[PDB]
């Protein structure tokens, strides 16, 4: 299944370690329309995904496709300014490749972000939802980045996922929000991932909500599974970019354009939160 050898991850971590002096302790993966979180890094050193051996390439609008090292609020971080998705043609073992490289780089905590359509009726476009848990739909069928022989050098054969999203960090993230001075509070809930690229139908939307999901996207989950597998501390949030249409009369239609726009209108609020969070 997984086509990368332990040495492939090594090779790439070796490459990065010899091209930058930066020794990141934290990794941030910036979802759709969230590339601006790169803006405040100091001593920033950028590498295009195209120049890093073994790295996949971002082909979705709103994904720069650059890995940026730097300092943010005192912390040494490496940011994925743009990510990879299954709908682009990538098996999960490709999508999550950076995650294992980060572990090899010496990173200890991974913060994942994404743009998600809201399923919980109380969410509003612009809301930031702390990811308390997830439902891995592709995983139900075996589409899993861990599928195939297990590399004990990364983790165990059957890793647990019920404690995936660090509770401490969600506690902190909430008080940090207090300091934000934001009107609307920091939401929290279950994120469900499905393949995409098409947006949901009304039946699907109703179905997903009844599964207990608050937000839906086409990313994040596989990165978290790989992160946990290799022991990374995980924290994640979705920016509610649109409310998925749950009725046959709504003239509304989900679209990537509005999603990127909502990301832009919130990258500021997100900029400080993630930094103060640092
Ligand atoms: N499944 C799904 N994804 C998204 C997204 C995310 N952003 C991109 C689509 O705009 C995809 O990568 C997806 O993960 C935003 N809104 C929605 C939505 O309503 N449904
Ligand atoms: Mg430099």
Curated annotation (Swiss-Prot):
InterPro entries with a match to the protein in the record: Nucleoside_phosphorylase_d, Nucleoside_phosphorylase_sf, Pur_Nuc_Pase_Ino/Guo-sp, Purine_phosphorylase, Purine_phosphorylase-2_CS
Enzyme class name: transferase
Catalytic activity: inosine + phosphate = alpha-D-ribose 1-phosphate + hypoxanthine; guanosine + phosphate = alpha-D-ribose 1-phosphate + guanine; 2'-deoxyguanosine + phosphate = 2-deoxy-alpha-D-ribose 1-phosphate + guanine; 2'-deoxyinosine + phosphate = 2-deoxy-alpha-D-ribose 1-phosphate + hypoxanthine
Pathway annotation: Purine metabolism; purine nucleoside salvage
Taxonomic superkingdom: Eukaryota
E.C. numbers: 2.4.2.1
Keywords: Acetylation, Cytoplasm, Glycosyltransferase, Phosphoprotein, Purine salvage, Transferase
Annotated binding of phosphate, by residue: 32, 63, 83-85, 115, 219
Cellular-component GO terms for this entry: cytoplasm
Any GO BP annotation: purine ribonucleoside salvage
CDD domains in alphabetical order: PNP-EcPNPII_like
Function in brief: Catalyzes the phosphorolytic breakdown of the N-glycosidic bond in the beta-(deoxy)ribonucleoside molecules, with the formation of the corresponding free purine bases and pentose-1-phosphate. Preferentially acts on 6-oxopurine nucleosides including inosine and guanosine.
PANTHER family referenced in this protein's UniProt entry, alphabetically: METHYLTHIOADENOSINE/PURINE NUCLEOSIDE PHOSPHORYLASE, PURINE NUCLEOSIDE PHOSPHORYLASE
Oligomeric and partner information: Homotrimer.
Family: Belongs to the PNP/MTAP phosphorylase family.
Name this polypeptide is given: Purine nucleoside phosphorylase
Gene that this polypeptide is encoded by: PNP
